Amino acid sequence: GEAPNQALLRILKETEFKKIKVLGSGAFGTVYKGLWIPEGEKVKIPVAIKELREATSPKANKEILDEAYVMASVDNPHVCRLLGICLTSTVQLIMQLMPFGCLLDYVREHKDNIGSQYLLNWCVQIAKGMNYLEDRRLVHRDLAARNVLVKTPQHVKITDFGLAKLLGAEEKVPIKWMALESILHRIYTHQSDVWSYGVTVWELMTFGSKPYDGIPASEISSILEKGERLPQPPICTIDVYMIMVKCWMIDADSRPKFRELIIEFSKMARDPQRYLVIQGDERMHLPSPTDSNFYRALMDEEDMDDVVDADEYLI
Numbered sequence: 569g570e571a572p573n574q575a576l577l578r579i580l581k582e583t584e585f586k587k588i589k590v591l592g593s594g595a596f597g598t599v600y601k602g603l604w605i606p607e608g609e610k611v612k613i614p615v616a617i618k619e620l621r622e623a624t625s626p627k628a629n630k631e632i633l634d635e636a637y638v639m640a641s642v643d644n645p646h647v648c649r650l651l652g653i654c655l656t657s658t659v660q661l662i663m664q665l666m667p668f669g670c671l672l673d674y675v676r677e678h679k680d681n682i683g684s685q686y687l688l689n690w691c692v693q694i695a696k697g698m699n700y701l702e703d704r705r706l707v708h709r710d711l712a713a714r715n716v717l718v719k720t721p722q723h724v725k726i727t728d729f730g731l732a733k734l735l736g737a738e739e740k741v742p743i744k745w746m747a748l749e750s751i752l753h754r755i756y757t758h759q760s761d762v763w764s765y766g767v768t769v770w771e772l773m774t775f776g777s778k779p780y781d782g783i784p785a786s787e788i789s790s791i792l793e794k795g796e797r798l799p800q801p802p803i804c805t806i807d808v809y810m811i812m813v814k815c816w817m818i819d820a821d822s823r824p825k826f827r828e829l830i831i832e833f834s835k836m837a838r839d840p841q842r843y844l845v846i847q848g849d850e851r852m853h854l855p856s857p858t859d860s861n862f863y864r865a866l867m868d869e870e871d872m873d874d875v876v877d878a879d880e881y882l883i
């Protein structure tokens with residue numbers, strides 16, 4: 569009883585885009601930072617290009633095209649979407665570049681300049697994107713700070729949809745972010761994503777700390793069974809920590825819904841200093857450059873007058 573998926577999959581020529589630098593390296597793949605120019609459209613679009621290292625793994629090609637399938641089928645401001653794929657010897661996935669990187673690295677880099685208003689706003693936007701995924705009956709199953717990307721300090725989107733799956737669908741795991749029911753019984757739900765959302769929030773509030781640092785994963789399942797949970801971050805009022813605790817309840821239907829988390833964090837974002845206590849909160853500012861020179865430096869391209877962000881390139 570699911571509806572037909574009429575998303576369009578766009579195929580791009582390798583000549584249309586160029587790679588500038590390597591963002592990340594991995595056995596499965598390499599991610600580049602690039603420019604994409606559509607033919608005879610006179611626009612330059614900053615992109616991240618995802619390349620798996622070799623065609624040789626059957627699972628691997630299945631893996632990236634499943635990811636392309638999911639990214640092509642979502643459309644939301646807090647969800648990363650796919651610009652297209654290139655059918656090279658190895659399949660390339662082309663997605664919009666998020667210039668400020670992943671939220672985990674950003675939070676660590678900028679812990680000294682990050683204010684309560686940004687932290688609570690990121691919490692709203694993540695919840696919004698996750699709620700959109702729930703509307704689409706999509707269970708992410710890998711929600712984490714590392715998988716949230718920063719378009720601007722004001723704007724973040726969810727990413728890493730490779731393990732994303734439909735809700736009732738039959739079917740190096742990260743145990744620390746996982747619901748207990750996921751760990752014990754491979755059960756995955758929107759409400760198991762809510763648990764992962766709690767841990768992601770805890771990461772942001774701890775400015776990038778590692779959860780259960782120094783604890784072996786094999787141990788983690790037992791810890792949770794006892795009722796141990798992640799500790800209350802220093803900057804966190806009991807109101808915020810309590811939200812985190814509700815996401816980590818054993819009864820999964822007991823946990824909050826993403827649409828509720830939007831509401832609650834949004835309310836808090838109206839009086840941020842009442843809910844997060846951060847030294848010198850008022851003083852702090854985070855740089856948010858809109859302009860063409862910022863791109864020229866980032867893309868190392870002399871002429872960026874025709875730059876257009878993916879969000880403004882609509883088909």
Ligand SMILES: */C=C\C(=O)Nc1cc(Nc2nccc(-c3cn(C)c4ccccc34)n2)c(OC)cc1N(C)CCN(C)C
Pocket residue numbers: 591592593599601616618663664665666667668669670671672673714717
């Ligand atoms: C958490 C690491 C990270 O995101 N680093 C990063 C990312 C970007 N922008 C960007 N935009 C879209 C997609 C990606 C991306 C996707 N995948 C699977 C990645 C793996 C590894 C790295 C990036 C990936 N990234 C960025 O844009 C300018 C910069 C950036 N930097 C420079 C931090 C690099 N550290 C890992 C050292």
